[PDB]
Design a protein around this ligand. Structure first.
Ligand SMILES: Cc1cc2nc3c(=O)[nH]c(=O)nc-3n(C[C@H](O)[C@H](O)[C@H](O)COP(=O)(O)OP(=O)(O)OC[C@H]3O[C@@H](n4cnc5c(N)ncnc54)[C@H](O)[C@@H]3O)c2cc1C
Ligand SMILES: Cc1cc2nc3c(=O)[nH]c(=O)nc-3n(C[C@H](O)[C@H](O)[C@H](O)COP(=O)(O)OP(=O)(O)OC[C@H]3O[C@@H](n4cnc5c(N)ncnc54)[C@H](O)[C@@H]3O)c2cc1C
Lengths: 482, 482
């Protein structure tokens, strides 16, 4: 159609927030969002990855597996539930998918009510102020605007040089939509996406195995990541440490013949699974954009979009947000706010910039891992072991006592500066409702909380989070942390 | 026996902490703890109210009822659990009680290892440096010490002028130990003790009714308390608003004939219940102390012990801690720390005082209510409506969506100062894992967090606590909070 004050490419977490805000600021906004299906042929509605194949489905299926543990615990507190309790993938999927759809329609209604022309068209630049797009039936349509915002996020990544890879494998995109149970599954990866999925899969009774080339959750505090995987294998998830896939052969039975190199024992083993999921990192969606045709530089290694402290780029009126923006953390909350504030800066008269420092997060694994601030190792790198004090503790959730469920791995460590009052650099929590616990402490770090203040902060008894506040044993002291 | 550097009357939350610390400071400590049974004849081990008839049993039975909701939700996520699932009080009680005992022995072992002579003797003063006590078989025993610490807490309170009261009623002390299901129960009270108990009782399938003379949770933010009870009656708990008991008659069937005045409708109705629990406030245990024989002044109204900012009293070497200390909040964490720090001050060389300001708390009702800082109403009283801004929101836990369980009452309000950056005065959370959520924010308030900082604090998605950080709609604005 004609032009708009603002045009947003990608109707997901970041983009939709930018549009809705701009639209709320009395500006004529337009958004184009197209869901190029997955190799396996999966596709979905408006809302981006988080809504359709990310946070939501993941968290809800995790909730499913958790409930399974809840039913065991149930009998300990007096609930005479017939223990031989099966779980069927169809019901769960049905339920999760329907909610996902509520969000699709929920967004369209929000875009309609704020009046934002929605073009389900996959964009690509032609010049510096215009884009061209195709649709379901494939037909061009001229679109331009003064300001443009790229919020195209990314997509899973397939392995290079692995026959059978595309032809038979599936990704995080396909799993939340499978029509029938994945049956026996092999998850290839060490990212949080990998761990979380094998986790709830194990939770719902599936034979699951994680294949890791090297270390777990690269990027996160290693001691905690270590504790996470240890909890997993101690509770059903099978692990293939130090292994890489080389090829997959489908059997006349339709099963998958996964062959691999085991760099930690022999040198090549093989297994048979019903599903093989590749969780090996994502790739920014810039390929199709023709960013070159618009003069928007991007960093070579990670095909992201180089950006300003104002999410700006090569061109002064073109901005990048979310998974595509280099440096920016791949989280839904940051993209939402970043884009929302960007709208505020453009036609809202605000001068506030997005602040990606100390962003709390939580990996939703069987035993949840929530953290905010510096990694221990990360802390000594910036200050030196000499100026860092680390308080830690193994604790036991009251609820775990009567349910008689293992408390190992329920560990908490708080990284502070050694000199008083000892500013807190990072907090790490491993246990039930980790995200629920970490959140509040994030405000503590954004405010500059100190260990001195932590000690003067009474706990809510009885709870797991109070343990965070009861921490007194440093690692330097050498004392037993239990 | 002979004297000790420190003598502690009452081996519970506050006292045991004081002793263990003093004992750890190389001082010879002694503690006397006697559990004068309840009118109904219930009694227990070392550890105080929290361990035996408070936080622990309460929280675990609450956990029981919660699991019941968890089993319903279970079917929605695909868990084919045979819905007609009964719950039996015997198993639960057995399980909860055994854990309670672990704490009894757990404490004795800690007192043995730190070497603290334990005299299961109910004390009473004779002079200013000595006490006299009786035991199981009742036999005196001379005990003195330079410093004395009174940590005798309190005990339930029976109604005055209500025939049938003692003869048939039970208290928070008796419920956690009942040998057989309470059957149909009537809870008389509006304190958190009252609500929490009728709550898990309803949770485990019992016909429960709360009888309230007037308002709920006097002392707490009224809007939130209102929301709490509303959630309860919307989910099984029956309410008798504006009623007072006048007499109880036992029927030849052993049931209880509760007669009462209904100041909100007729003027006198009657009901029949299996159990009647009086949750109408506690009373400090000073009666038996002969505080007069030692010259320790106490405030008339609340028979507590008047104290210094150092938990000191009339006499310079006698200190009071916990439920007996006037002004001090009746919580386990405060008593623990207060007593621990007191030890640090005496023979530890510390000059730090206990800080009872902004203590977070959480009432464990069907739908949990966690809060810290000022009550809204409390805030306008100290600053004036004119200088207070209140942000609020109704939200829906992701997990509630697929389980299809009502989100009403899931409300969050944050009371701040109106002038920027808008210091936060109090935070109120109503929903799942309230204590888990509130804790962290307590550190935020102890640090002086501001709403400006709250807005710059990214949330962990998806979680309930992130809602706390997403708050943007003020009450002044008049806008819809959903
Ligand atoms: C398995 C998994 C689990 C996750 N769990 C969490 C979690 O618990 N918490 C959390 O905070 N984050 C989580 N994330 C990450 C989160 O979903 C992303 O950080 C967030 O979606 C990024 O937002 P975005 O707006 O940048 O892009 P996206 O939400 O990915 O949206 C981009 C949109 O643009 C479309 N598009 C792409 N190219 C074009 C084009 N050329 N033309 C038109 N449209 C185009 C896409 O198809 C899509 O609809 C998870 C991710 C995965 C994969
Ligand atoms: C139903 C209920 C639920 C609760 N839930 C919570 C909760 O979730 N969280 C929380 O933080 N708090 C909770 N509390 C309150 C908490 O238990 C108290 O605040 C805490 O126990 C007070 O500690 P204390 O050391 O002062 O006294 P107590 O723990 O009460 O200990 C006093 C001890 O001294 C003994 N004693 C008394 N008089 C004498 C004497 N003359 N000679 C010798 N010994 C004597 C007593 O028998 C007892 O063993 C709850 C209370 C109740 C009643």
């Amino acid at each position: 159609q004609q032009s708009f004050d603002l045009l947003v490419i990608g109707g997901g977490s970041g983009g939709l927030a930018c549009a809705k805000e701009a639209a709320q600021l009395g500006k004529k906004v337009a958004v184009a969002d197209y869901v190029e299906p997955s190799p396996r042929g999966t596709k979905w509605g408006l809302g981006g990855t988080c809504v359709n194949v990310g946070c939501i489905p993941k968290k809800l299926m995790h909730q499913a597996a958790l409930l399974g543990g809840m039913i065991r615990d149930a009998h300990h507190y007096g609930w005479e539930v017939a223990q031989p309790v099966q779980h069927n993938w169809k019901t769960m999927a049905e339920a999760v998918q329907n909610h996902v759809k509520s969000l699709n329609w929920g967004h369209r209604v929000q875009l309609q009510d704020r009046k934002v022309k929605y073009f389900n068209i996959k964009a690509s630049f032609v010049d510096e102020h215009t884009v061209r797009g195709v649709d379901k039936g494939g037909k061009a349509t001229l679109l331009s605007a003064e300001h443009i915002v790229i919020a195209t996020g990314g997509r899973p990544r397939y392995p290079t040089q692995v026959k059978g890879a595309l032809e038979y494998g599936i990704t995080s995109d396909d799993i939340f939509w499978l029509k029938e149970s994945p049956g026996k599954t092999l998850v290839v990866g060490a990212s949080y996406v990998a761990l979380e999925c094998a986790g709830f899969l194990t939770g719902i009774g599936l034979d699951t195995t994680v294949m890791m080339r090297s270390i777990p959750l690269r990027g996160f505090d290693q001691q905690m990541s270590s504790l996470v995987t240890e909890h997993m294998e101690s509770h059903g998830t099978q692990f293939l440490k130090g292994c890489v896939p080389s090829h997959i052969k489908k059997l006349p039975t339709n099963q998958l013949q996964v062959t691999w190199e085991d760099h930690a024992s022999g040198k090549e083993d093989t297994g048979t699974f019903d599903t093989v999921l590749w969780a090996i990192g994502r790739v920014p969606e810039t390929r199709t954009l023709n960013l070159e045709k618009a003069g928007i530089s991007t960093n070579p290694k990670n095909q992201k979009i180089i950006v300003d402290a104002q999410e700006a780029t090569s061109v002064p009126h073109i901005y990048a947000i979310g998974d595509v923006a280099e440096g920016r953390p791949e989280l839904t909350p940051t993209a939402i706010k970043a884009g929302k504030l960007l709208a505020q800066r453009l036609f809202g008269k605000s001068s506030t910039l997005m602040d990606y420092s100390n962003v709390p997060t939580t990996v939703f694994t069987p035993l949840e891992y929530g953290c905010v601030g510096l990694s221990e190792e990360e802390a000594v790198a910036l200050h030196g072991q000499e100026h860092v004090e680390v308080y830690h503790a193994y604790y036991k959730p009251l609820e775990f006592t009567v349910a008689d469920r293992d408390a190992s791995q329920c560990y908490i460590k708080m990284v502070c500066m050694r000199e008083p009052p000892q500013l807190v650099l990072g907090l790490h929590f491993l246990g039930p409702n980790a995200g629920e616990v970490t959140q509040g402490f994030a405000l503590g770090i954004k405010c500059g909380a100190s260990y001195a203040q932590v000690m003067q902060t009474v706990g809510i008894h009885p709870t797991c989070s109070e343990e965070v506040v009861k921490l007194h044993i440093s690692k330097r002291s050498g004392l037993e942390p239990t």
